[PDB]
C-alpha cells in the first residue's frame, strides 16, 4: 500500500522521531533532490497554509502527468512536513486526501520505479 | 504529542501487523481492545456497509461519543476493524481518519490525560 507507506513517511518527516524510522523510507528520502530547501517557505505561502494545514498541494496548480511529478509532490510534502514543525493542530487527513487524489493513478508506475 | 499522528500510526499497524512498524507508544492503545469483543467485529463491518475501498466508517454505527471512555471504544473498533478488513492497498485511509478525528478530536485533551 503506497497509501500506508506515504502516510508513515510524511508523518516521520514531520516528527523526526528515530523510533518511527523505517528502511522503507530510504528510497523516498532520495526524492528530496527534486525540491530546493530555499523554495519551501515559498511553496508554503503559495498553498496559503494556516497553522492547522499540512501540505495542500492542489493549490500549487502544478500538473501531475507522470511518475517524476509524483516524486516532486512527495518531496514537497516531506520538506513542508519537515519545516512546519511537530504541531498537534495539523489536520493530516486533509493533506493526505489532497495528495492521494493527485497521485493514486500513478501508484502502479511509482511501485515499478521503487522496486 | 499529536494524538492525530499516534492514532494514524496505531491503526495502520493494526491493519498490516508489520512488526517493523510496532512502537511502544501503542501499548496503552492495545489495552482498549478489551472494550470490543472479536465476535462483534464482522457485525459492525456489515452495519457500516463497507466496500473493499473503505476503512472504518464509524459515523455509520449510530454509537454515542460523549466521553473519553467512548473514544477508547471508537479507537478499539478502528483497530479491530482495521485488523479484520485485511492489508489491501485500495483502502481509502484518508476518508476513515477524517471520520474518526471529526468524531473524537474534542476529547484529545481528556485522552492525553488518561494515557499520561
Curated annotation (Swiss-Prot), chain A:
Pfam families: Poxv_Bcl-2-like. The keyword NAD does not apply. One of its GO terms (biological process) is symbiont-mediated perturbation of host defense response. Keywords: Early protein, Host-virus interaction, Inhibition of host NF-kappa-B by virus, Modulation of host cell apoptosis by virus, Viral immunoevasion. Transmembrane segments: none annotated. The keyword NADP does not apply. Induction: Expressed in the early phase of the viral replicative cycle. Bcl-2-like protein which contributes to virulence by preventing host NF-kappa-B activation in response to pro-inflammatory stimuli such as TNF-alpha or IL1B. Belongs to the poxviridae OPG035 family. This is Protein OPG035. It comes from Monkeypox virus.
Amino acid at each position: 500500500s503506497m497509501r500506508t507507506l506515504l502516510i508513515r513517511y510524511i508523518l516521520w518527516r514531520n516528527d523526526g522521531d528515530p523510533s518511527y524510522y523505517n528502511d522503507d523510507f530510504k528510497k523516498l528520502i532520495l526524492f528530496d533532490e527534486l525540491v530546493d530547501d530555499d523554495d519551501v517557505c515559498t511553496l508554503i505561502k503559495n498553498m496559503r497554509m494556516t497553522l492547522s494545514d499540512g501540505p495542500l498541494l492542489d493549490r500549487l496548480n502544478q500538473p501531475v502527468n507522470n511518475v517524476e511529478d509524483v516524486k516532486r509532490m512527495i518531496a514537497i510534502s516531506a520538506k513542508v512536513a519537515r519545516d512546519i514543525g511537530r504541531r498537534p493542530e495539523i489536520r493530516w487527513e486533509d493533506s493526505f486526501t489532497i495528495l492521494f487524489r493527485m497521485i493514486e493513478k500513478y501508484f502502479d508506475d511509482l511501485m515499478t520505479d521503487l522496486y
